[model samples]
Each structure stands twice: as C-alpha cells, then as structure tokens.
Target: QGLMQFTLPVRLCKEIELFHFDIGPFENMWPGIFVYMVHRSCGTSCFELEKLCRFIMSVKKNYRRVPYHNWKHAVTVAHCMYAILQNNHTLFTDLERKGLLIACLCHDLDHRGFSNSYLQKFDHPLAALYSTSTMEQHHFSQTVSILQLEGHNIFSTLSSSEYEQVLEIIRKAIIATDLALYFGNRKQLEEMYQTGSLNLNNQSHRDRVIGLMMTACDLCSVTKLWPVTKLTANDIYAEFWAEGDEMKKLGIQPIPMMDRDKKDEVPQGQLGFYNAVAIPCYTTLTQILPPTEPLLKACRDNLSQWEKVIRGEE
Candidate 1:
C-alpha cells in the first residue's frame, strides 16, 4: 500500500486554504501532495511528477527530528510558497514561480535545530564551507546535490537555458532566507516603496522582491492564526532550549531565548521578533504586493495575542 500510494496522484481541492490545513501528517501526504502541487503549477509530465515525488521523499529523509526545523517545517514553508504563487500567478513568470516553490521545499534541508552562530561557535563543517550565509549556502548545496541524485532531476524536461535559469533563481531564493540578508533586503525594499521606484519590470528589482517573499514564507509562523502561532513558538523554543543545553555542557553561555532558565522571557522574545522582523518584512512586501495584506494583518493579530499571553490573559 505504501508503494502504491507513492504511484497514485493525490487530488487537491482548489478551495483548500493551505495555511489553515493541518500538516502533522506531512510525511504521509508530502510526496503525493507536493508532486500534485508542482504538477498543477508547472504542468510537469506524469513521469516527471513521479521523479519529483521520489526527490521530495529523499529530501524528507534528510531532515532531522528536532523540535522544529524538521520535515514538517519544510512542508509548511513549501505550502506557503505554493499559496503565494497561486495568489500572485500573473506577478511572476512560470520559471520564477516554479523555482520559488522548489527553493522553499529545499530551503531548510538538513537543519540541526541550531543557528549559524551555534554552528560557527563549534566550528561546524558548514561554517567552514561558508564563512557567511553558512546555513543558507549549505541548504542550497544540499538542494543541488539532491537534484543530482538518481531519478531526481525533475528539471530534466526544461531546456538547458531554462534549467540554468531555474537553478539560479532557486539558489538566490534559498540563500535569501538567511535572516542576516533579510534586514538589508527589507531596508532596500522599504526605500524602493517609499520612492515609488519598485518596478516589477526590472529584473534586479523583481529578484529582490522574490528574495523578500521567500523570507516572508520562511518566517510565516508568526503570520498564522494565534493557536498555530503559539504552538509554533513553543516548538521553536524547544529547539532553542535544546541547543542551550548543549552550550551549557560546553561551558558556553546561551542566548536568552535559548536558555531554558529564561522561559519566562520567551513571550517577550517573540514580541520583539514580531515588532522587529516579521511585521516589517510583511508590511514592506504588502507595499508592492497588496494581496499580502492578510499576512501583515495576521502578524498584527498574533502580536496582540502575544501581548495578552504575556499578561496571562490568554
């Protein structure tokens, strides 16, 4: 039955709200649903869809079982990318759309539930390979490596030029998820919006927008409903506290968010993140893409809930 399920295409309801749907069973549904999404969006052949399914399954196998940043998080990010692509179909070329979704699917490949700082502190190999953009760079390489695996080059159907274009976009999109890069990109986007110079016709401008959009999708938990947001925060902190436990064993001081002893500060940390990162990114994107207002609204709503939680009013 498992093998048969892999071969059968899963039908998707056009009305399904990707964000609201439960992704806990992502392992069961991931291969079928992911291939179905790509097929519907990019019109890949049945044979290619099968290959893509095999690729996604292989990718899922690579994810570690941390409290967060696991296969489920990857699936959710990909689903957000899928939703954004659907909502703004006319805003991007087919190449851009396809690459965006693929990048999201592979963005967090092989995450260790530790930040780049943690890896760098321990002299992790990925930190050595990439002096900067450490995790993002490694994630992109993993995506490339996965595509090179047997029967996994789902882009085989594209022409050589199209193939290169897709790979290039996917590389840029994945690397853009490094929050270090996001603040700079967000600053430029905000300035562009203020000066009314954000033209979609410009390739460079369009690429920047795509980068910020990728970051938005990567940090999408804060922009979900309160229940989803709260649960995601707890899971994320679970991962953080685990890393803190390791750091303590090494006799290194952990950041407040990572320190299990500072559990009471978690809500404040979340509120700070929303005010500093999530809200700014979403609101800036909405300036160029008004359809993204809902993301901004969701973040605002979550912010209110966080404040109430801090006061024990939830």
Candidate 2:
C-alpha cells in the first residue's frame, strides 16, 4: 500500500472524469483505484488527503477475497453512496455525508462470504459475539478497529461531540446492511414516506433514512444495467453455492437458491428477489427522494427483462 499510496491515484486520474455515475468502472478495474475518488465525490474535507488515502488502503485490505462480498463489493457500495450524495447533497449534513460513505465503504469488512444465519446455525464465534446481526456487528467493530490504526483515523480532527455523532451514524448504517435490519427499515421508511413523517432534520429520522440509503447502495447491483447485474448476480450465487457445498458436507441442507443442484431456479429466483426485496426498496426510495428515481427505473427495467427470461421472450 505504501508503494500504491500515490501511483494508483495518479495513474487512474484520467478515468476519474468518466465516473460521475453510480455505474462504476469497477467491473474490470482494480478495486483500489476508486476508493479515493468516491471519497472526494462526496466532498468531505475533515480528514487530510494523506491520511484518508492511507486509511482506505488499510480498509481495502481488511476485506477477504470472497467471490462477491469482497473489496470490490465494498468500494462499489461506497461508490453508489457517492452517486446518491451528489444528487441530493443538501439532504445530508457534512458529518452525515462522510459517515455514510465510510459506513458503506467498510460495511462488509472481513466478510466470510457466509450469511449471518449460517454463522448462527454453526454457532460460529462471530455469532457468539453478537446475538443478532452477527456479521454486521462484527463489521462495525472492525470499522472501529481500523480507525484506531495509526494514520488510519481520518476523523482525528473532529470535535469530540462530532466524533461521537459520526461513529453513531457509522454503527447504525453498517448494522443496517444486514437483511434482518433492512426488512424492518424498508417497512418503517416506506410508511414514513407515505404518512409524510420522514424528516431529514430529525436525528433518528435521518438515521433511519441513512439505514435505508445504505441498503439501497448495498443492493445497487440490482439497479445496475442488465449485463452487469447478470454478471454480479452470478458472482453472488457462486459465493452462495460455495457456502452451500460446505453446508452439505456438514449434513445440513441449503436453500434452493444456495444449492448448485437447483441451478434451473436462477431466473425465477431472481424475479422473486426483485419483487420481494429489490423493487419495493427502490420504489419507496424514489418516492422519498425523487432524485433516486433513476435507480428505480433501472431496477424496473431489469425486472422486466428477468421476467422476459422466465417467459422465454429473450
């Protein structure tokens, strides 16, 4: 990383002009190339550039090289947040903006490519440490640990109160990435938007939306153009089936989506995911923040294409 400190950014500088959109150049690009760019996109300057760069270098290394939930996934999630923040900059405060980026940036730190339920069922040490949101909790703690590293404390200059507030948002935002929390957040946030109760000025309300936004960014794969979405979906299932293969050897049956033997189920299963989780999420989000409607549009377009696949229209 020391050698990569300046060269990566300098070499990638020209392509930075190609970014401005949430759809990342990440598909074929080195993951290290964009963390700093995403950080700058949000325009937070609390941290010195040198420390911020070094901090993310450390941050990227914390990720395991799993098929999907690795460094690539983490930075892309952060990149999606950058896209959202740019369109609605006034919706987030300075600290909140930085918190959201960093939270999404490190949301899946050291992920083992297994779901929280797997950890719970295996009585894994991580699940033992946190009763629920096991992996998400661990990721939050990892974020704290990374911040404590020398030169990795990008928020070192924040006032004590400001520091507390940013960490609070970071904890909640990272924990919210767990699907358990996301389900509840989606319901509550959807209602808040419906009843006209969503207010960015209120701390808790803003925090709740922060949760929703993180989930939105985390699932931004669905909102992507169909080709990338298909490629990413394959990577996700590859990771899932790897876990399922291990589970089979442990004498437990995995779900259809996780079972490689059920490969035929992929298209329909994707449709179910879009309808049950992805569509509803982006729908409510675009309603609350119209600037996010593009996400919803892309999502719907992909759903229809998936529908066509199941119908043999393609």
Candidate 3:
C-alpha cells in the first residue's frame, strides 16, 4: 500500500545484528532499518510497515547531501534511539518510546550543514520563520509535512489524543537535539540524577530524560569506536569548513571550528565538547538509566582517545 517500490537491502536485513558506527552500507540502509524498528517497537502490521517504508523513503530523500548530517547520520541517530528503547523498554510509556524513535529519525531533516546561528547570520528564511530554535522548528515542520503525505501517516491508527501526544513529544525531542537547548536540561538532569530523586514516571521528569536521550543519540558519533569516531569527526569538520567557505564568500567571519585555517583547534574543540556536553549528558543518562552505562563508557573511551590524540600519542 506504500508509494515506494523498494525492498530492504539483503545485506542489511541479514546482517542487521552486526550494525554499528563502524559498520558499512548504512547510508542507504535507513529505510529498511527504520521500517524494521517501527514494526518491532510499535508492533505494526505488514500493511503498516509498508506505509512506514514509504514515509521513511520520502524522509530520507529530503535529507541533504551534506558531509556529516546526511542520511547516514540520521540512521545512526535512529539506531541509538532504538538501542535506548530496547534497553529500557519498561521505563517508558508506549507513546514516549515511539515518539522518541521517530523524533531521532526526523531531528535533522533538511539540514543545510549550517547551525541555527549561521542561518540567523545570513537571514535565512527559516530563521525568520522561527525566531527561536530556527533549524529545529523547520526540521519538525518538515517531519510534519512528510507525515501529512498520502499513505504516510503511520500513526493514523492512534486515537486523537495519542496522536497529539506523539506529535508533542516528537516536537520536544527533536528540538532538544539543539545543543543550545540541551544545556538547560543538562544541569537539571545531573542534579536530579545525582540526588537519586529522578522519578522516571513523573511526566516532567520523563520528558526531560527523553530530551537528554535525544541529545545523547544525536552526538552518538563521539561515543563510537575511536576509528569510526575519527572518520565521523573528520566528516563533520568537512561540513563545517564548507560552511566556512560560504561565510568567507559572504564576507562573514567563520566560527573558529569552521575556519579551515584553525584545523588545530579540532582536538581542543572536541575536548571542550566532551567536557561541557557529551560527558555530562551521557553520565546523567547512565545514572538515571543504568542499562545505558555502556553509552557513558563509549563516551569516556572516546574522550581518552581524544586526549591521546591531543597529547601527540596518536
């Protein structure tokens, strides 16, 4: 019943268990993997999976051909979200779990490889459309646009209230990936988790946790195996430098990380990123959801690897 006429790639379906950051062939594997995720997680029927596949195919086509934030990054983030849901299935309501899964898939839809700040600097139309959370607002809007497509409302089976709840959570979770908004939840999460007072069933508490989970998965590249992490890091800078090139063309100064001449700042930038963001966020996740300790381990391990690279030991 889906509009798309595609089948799951044999390799991905057969070898799905072996998938990871270092795994090959994920760029185009998203459609199959995402369909399988939704089917399994939401117990969707075969007809539903077909509709979902059509939706995913459309969404995948919308992702720009950027260096880092391409379709591959979307799949990776969705995989991490799937992992979180699989590991802590009992901790979340059905609606929360499904919302987070879809949110991760759609979080960076149509990214121009430019941050919200860059869009604002250039007076990008999206920036004007959304005075705050510019890119995120557009991403969510793009997601809704796809869902509104014919034969693509996979959540069409939901009751009106449930549908509304899913959309609300999806909006919150997608926008939560903006690092600017992550900081506000970061401190509250850490304090709550550290004091052992995070009541997971509490609506506010649960929403903040899902928000942090979105950020954790968004930055999952940093927690990958060192080699995989390095490759992804380089790809990210390639995009950053491309934006820098555009900034130079417009006579606007590039951000330090974006400046190709400031390549030496990458390690320092990553160090600060882990310290100020990844570590704290992952640490909070592990504390609240102990099964997620491996994510923290991966982040810490990557931090050590970044340290070694900085110390000239690579």
Candidate 4:
C-alpha cells in the first residue's frame, strides 16, 4: 500500500493563512515529510535516512544569510515540492519524488547575493565552468559535495544504481531552474502539450514536465497570497539592491530592478514578471497537471490586484 498522501489539517491551513510560517527545523514540515517519505513507499520505493539531523543542519548552515536566496527560501521551496507530491502522490515515480524534494532542498545552496551575470562579469571561478547556468551548476555541485560528507549520505541504503538515477534527476531539476532554460524548455514541452502527447510514462516527456515543475516551485512565491507575494518582491529587490551596489562599484549602471533609486519601478517589474514568466508557467502546469490550477488562480489574483494598483485603482 502507498503511504497516505498528506496535507495540514484544515485548521492548520487556516493558521498558515493568518500568519507567517517559520520557526526552527522541528516545527516545520521539511524533516517530518522527509522522514515520512523515506520511511514508507508512496507509489515509488522509499529511500533510507541516516545522519538526518546533521544533513538538515548543515544544509541550512551552508546557505548564507542573504536577503532573499537563503536557507528559509530553500525550505519554503521544499515545502511547495512536498505539497505537490502529497497532493498527487501516485502521479510521479519514486525517483522523481525524491529528486524533486532533494533538488529543492539543495537548489540554492551557498547562493551568494549576486546574479549569474555578475559572476560572469567579474570572471568569477564558477562562471568558468559554464558560460550559462554558472550559479546553478555550482549549486548542484555543492549538493553532491554535501552528500559525500561522512554520515551525510542520506541515500545510504539505496542500491548504487538508484542513487545515480536520483542524482541525474536532481541535476536536471536544479539546472532547469535557470531562467535561460525557461523558453527553450517551454518551446519543446509546449509542443507536446499542444499535440496532446504528454505521456508521463515516456522518459523524455516526464523529464520535461518535471523540469517545468522545478521552476514552478522556484517561482511559486507569485502563486501565494498577497503578503507572501509582497515580502518576496520586497526582499528580491533588497537582494538585488545589494548586488546593485556591487555592480556600481564594479563599474556599471545597474538595471531598474537593482537600483534602489528606481524603487517606484518595482511595481511595474512585478506586473511584468507575473504576465511574462509566472502566468505562463502556471497555466502550462495546470494544463498538464490540473491539480495546479488552484495555484494558477492565486497567481492571477496577484496579477489583477497589481494591475489595479498600477492603474491607481487601489
């Protein structure tokens, strides 16, 4: 039998809506679902856990105290992945479920407060590894490195082949998160969705959809409520402002998104991102996976509200 698909109790859901959802590791779902998922089969075979405490601890510690892309962001992203799997447990394979969760856990590991272009501009060592996806590649590299640590091998009980399989999905997921891959991937996957040929059993199709979900979760802040959406916008701008300072010192004018002086432009930027990247992304997910429609609704809600704000209708 499959492990029970999970959700917070209705009251708890109401609770989350009324306030912020943050605290330490134990109070959160990361460890709880991690343990539950690994301990029991849920359509896919389960992996084992060891040094679980240390792994979560170090994973959190590894992320810097940046304004936005930090450990809490990783955990929140992981929570999205959890809800995704729990809501549609039987839809994905065991390997992909693990990959999705772990990829989110490790997605932005050691993320410094700079954009990929900044690294490339400075000839940073990570950029030398790949002209594109410099930070993404480094993030996956860091995940592998963390797993290699003593007692850090949470996949300890897996068959050698199983671990490799998970690693590939993790790589595909983590790398797919790069904004550059969005159009190329959507162009290909959109063709499949158009042709009505989205067979999850097909490896090529499955991986492509998985890739979309990876980015969907990464950008899911837009799919949340107003407060969550507002904080994310503010923090992302704050994060960029810090980088904007560096870019200025490094001899370049920062973009409006980065320029604190251009703060009033943030609302327009938010609206643009919603219509361009997030709206399209969620609609596609809802098309292929209808359960995602609720997220799309919440996403569009934010858009309409912002549109009103820009029109001075607020």
Candidate 5:
C-alpha cells in the first residue's frame, strides 16, 4: 500500500560519488600522530567508509517517505556527532573521537527505511536472526557482510587488536540506536549505566549519543524555535493520523498517532506522548548527560501546550 519503487545499485553509486576523498579536510589530521584523526580510531580499509556511505545512500534513494529516520536522518546524526565532539569537552582523545564519528555514520547503515514496528510485525528475516530485540541488528549484520565482501572491511588495515577495539566501538554505537528511549524507554539501561561496570566497551557512550540524537531529530519538531516547531508538529500529527487510519482497516493495533477513533482527540495523544514518553524520559536522560537539558525543557513546554490545543483554548 506504500510506494515500492527503489534501485539499490544506482543509490550505491551515488553514495560512492559523494564520499570520495575530495569531499573535505583530510587536513584535520593531528600534527604527526595520524593521517586523519577521525580515521585513526574509526579505522579504514582502502575504501570501506566510502562503501558504507554508498550503502546508506542506496537505501535512501529507494524508499523516501519513511519520515525523519531516513538516510538524511543518518547523515544529520553523523553531523551531530562531529558537532558534539568538536564543541564538547570529553576525555576522548582525537583517536577516540574519530572512532565515535565513524560509529555514528555507520550506525544506521543499511536500514530497510522502515520503523521497528513494521519489522517486528512482519517477522523480517533480521528479526528472526537476532539473539535480542535489537531491531537494527539486521542492518548492522548487513553492514558487516558488505564490508567482508572483497574490498569492504573499512578497518582491515588496522592490526588485529586495534581492529577488534574499533569494531567494538562501532558495534556498541550502532546497537544502542535501537534503544528507542523516547518510545521504547531506557529505564533498564539507566540502571545498568549507574553501575560502574559500564565502560566504553561494555555500555556504549557513543550509542547513547547517537540514539538520543536520532530521537532528538525525530522529535526535533517539538523543540525547534517556537512556531516552527508547531508547524512540524502539525505535519507529524497528520502523518500519525494517516498511519493509524490504515492500521485500523487492517485490524492491527494502530500505531501511535494513527488511531482513527481518537482523531478528534489527537492533541491529547500528543500531550500524552510528550508527558509520559518525552518529558519524563528525557529528563532522566539529562541526569546522565546535561547538554540535553535544553531539549528536555523544550519537550516539557511542548507538552504543556497540548492541553491548551486539546481544549481548543487558542
């Protein structure tokens, strides 16, 4: 019932064209220690990063209407990672920071351009193959598979130990994106992180950033400066309504925002989402990472207006 047209190969070619070396500063290299700071920790075969970029670009070309979580979304998250590293102060050395950036870019590689709900319901092959409910595991496996095929292991040049370390960072970063803190809830993770046992290899600081960033972008409409956020919220609500209408027809549990019987009360749904899902959850996240405070406040304010809108007060 959705548009099903897509060309994987053409998209891949386009991505290759985009990520080629001439793209930016290999100049960011730190003095004499590394050829490319980001590359040192992220690792790279002759052309693995390029391939991963192309893979994502390929997926995006075919399915373009999956909402904010598309290839563009992945790119935005990657950019955010760079921005965070560049602006924030952390113990991560240049090498470590670069590793985080690589993880961010590749984290969402090879997504089917659909939400977790679709995969979970359809029994997608990746879902069955996974040992856990990490909806993105299939995407991650596909990424690894592509790298192994011929000249794709981006980090193949690294020594075995370094390779494993980089891979560990990459894997942790990608898997954590599935946390879905906004909708899926990260209560268990919060508890886990509280224990000192969570380290770079074990708990995944990069994934936490990426997941929160993805969710941030996903809900950015709620935080954008004032009225702009409202406009995006309206567009989001409309899409949610449309999705719910379709689900009801199919006798499936209507996805959030898609409930037809509650169409007149959508503002309330939005309110509930902001309150039960957004505010409380994000506030908890802020306790772990403080930069998120502004976003969390925006979320609460966004919810406050829901009552006004639902009551038709303005």
Candidate 6:
C-alpha cells in the first residue's frame, strides 16, 4: 500500500491545545503501534511497546533542539522508508514495516543539531567514540538507551532471538541514514542486489529496507512536489549556514558547504548542491515514487529562478 493511503492521520494538532486527535486518534496510539505493524508484516518482533514508546516520545521532545535532526527529519526518514517499500516489492510483513518505521523515527534521537564535524570539533564523545567510521552510531546508541526505561525496556519484552533480530534491523537501517555513510552503503546494496541476496529474510529483510530508506531520505526531495522540495532544500542549507557560524565563533572548522569564512554568505554553496547532487539523486528516486515529481520540479524551478536573478535578469 502507498504511504498516503496507509498514513492513518490518527492525531490532529490544533491551535492553543497544540496537539489534538482525529476521530481515529493517534494521540494515544503509543509508538508500540509502529512495533505492532512491523511485527505483523515481518514476523520479526523486536522490542516492547511501552519502552519503545517512551524512547520515541523522548526523541520527539528533544530532537528538535538538535537543529537539522528534528521531527521533520524523522518524518522525512519515515516517508522515505514508505516510498522505498512502495517502489520495491519485498515480501515485507506488517511487523517488518512497523520495525522500519520505528528505526526511521528514532534514528537520530536527541541530536546536537550540529553536523558530525561540529559535534566532533567540540570533543564530543560520539565523534571520539565513532571517529570517521560511523558518525551516527553514538546518536543511535543514545536513542536506544533512552527507551530502555528500566522494566520498560522495549527489547526486553521480546524473546532473546526476537530481541536480537530487532536490534540488528534497527541498527542497520538507522546507520544507513548517516549522510556521510551513503557511498559505502550504496555499494553494499548494489553488490547484494547483483548477487540476488538482497531479498526478504529476518536477517536481510530489515537491513535491506534500512539501506534503501536511508538512501532515499538522505537524498531528500525524492518524491516531494517541486516547490516544496525547493523550500526544504533551502531550509537545509540555512540550518547548515547557521551551524557554520556557530562553529566559526567557537574556533572550529566548518563543514565544507557551510564554510562561510571562505564565502560571502550562507546558502552560497547550497544552490549548487541542490542543482547537482540532490537534484539528480532525487529525480531518480521520484521516478520510482511518482507523486514526488511536482516537488522535485519546484526545486528545479526555484534554482533556475535563482540563476536568473544571479544573472541580473530578475
């Protein structure tokens, strides 16, 4: 089923009260529903609902403070996972689907907002611990830890075999989302696909899903309408630029695209990346999820407009 069709808008948020509920209220669904879905689809039970819910709620509350890695990012990742499933025919069970959703939503719980570079620049333990190998590993660990709420440990409720299975799926999928980790992951996926070893298995099922989903989300704009994609693309750079400024003030080296010290302003390099790297990547992805074409086109249009203005035509 397609995402739009499956997305049960259970919760409805309103003014003043902040978050509200629809007739089929999701407000009280508890993230365990995500687990239930995965269990139903994949038959790969991973974690306890109560504990996972606590963890997910904690992430929903704190991730925004981490800048780029906020609720939008979570939702985006989940969206990508959905798109991947829609395009690719894997014999995924409901349980597997639910598992993937949880992984996507909780991938970067409580991020520090800064890119891995900035986080590492400040001698953050995650950077030191993961080094260049896996910048997101620490974030993943922290996310899992928060949900292991004493007796409420999500995985604790699972059989040892089921618990192990969940950990492997979630870790593989979440780690695939690290922006810096795509090339290696893509290469692995390609190789696996060529070998015809990338199909559904409790071991490989969730892992493959994670790889595809992470790749889709990292590229962003994959299936969105064009105009929306442009706005989101710009917002991405704006956040990076702010982070660059923060790094500069702290006497740290800014990540490549956000390095304003060598540029005249923020969002400078953003335009180019949107046109070249992100555009093509998303274009191909949207081809698989046709609903996203309008968004991608919008991004293209916005970039062209910027180009015209830069040329003094506008």
Model number with the top TM-score:
1
How many clashing pairs per prediction, in order? 0, 0, 0, 0, 3, 27
* TM-scores for every candidate against the unseen true structure: 0.92, 0.90, 0.91, 0.88, 0.63, 0.67
Candidate 2 lDDT tens digits, 1-314: 22233234444565333212333545435444454554455443555677787887888889998899988788778777877887786777888877887898799999989998778777798877899888989999999999999888888888999999999999999988988778888898888888998887888887777788888889988877678888899999999999899789778999999999999899999999999999988887888888988888888889998998888887
The TM-score of predicted model 6 comes to 0.67
Quantify all predictions' global Cα lDDT against the true fold: 0.82, 0.80, 0.82, 0.77, 0.51, 0.57
C-alpha-based local distance difference test score of model 6: 0.57
Off by over 4 Å in 2: 1-44
Backbone clash total, candidate 5: 3
Ranking by TM-score: 1, 3, 2, 4, 6, 5
Q: Write the per-residue lDDT of candidate 1 for residues 13-99, one digit (tens) a residue.
A: 543345444355547866666665676665554335567678888899988998889988887887777777777768889788678
Model 6, position 224: C-alpha lDDT score? 49
**Candidate 3 global TM-score:** 0.91
- What value does the lDDT take at residue 192 in candidate 5? 52
Selected candidate, larger lDDT, 1 vs 4: 1
- Model 5 superposed RMSD (Cα): 10.3
lDDT per residue for candidate 4 within 1-314, as digits (tens), equals 23444445565444432212332345355555444433432333354334655787778889998888987788777766666666676798867766687898889999998889999878898888878899999999999998898888877867889889989999989999898888788778888899988788898888888888888888878877777788677888888998888889889898989988898887799888998899888888888888777778888999987888789886
Our model 3 lands, by Cα RMSD against the true structure, at 3.1
Which residue ranges in model 1 land beyond 4 Å of their true spot?
1-15, 44-47
Better of 2 and 6 by TM-score: 2
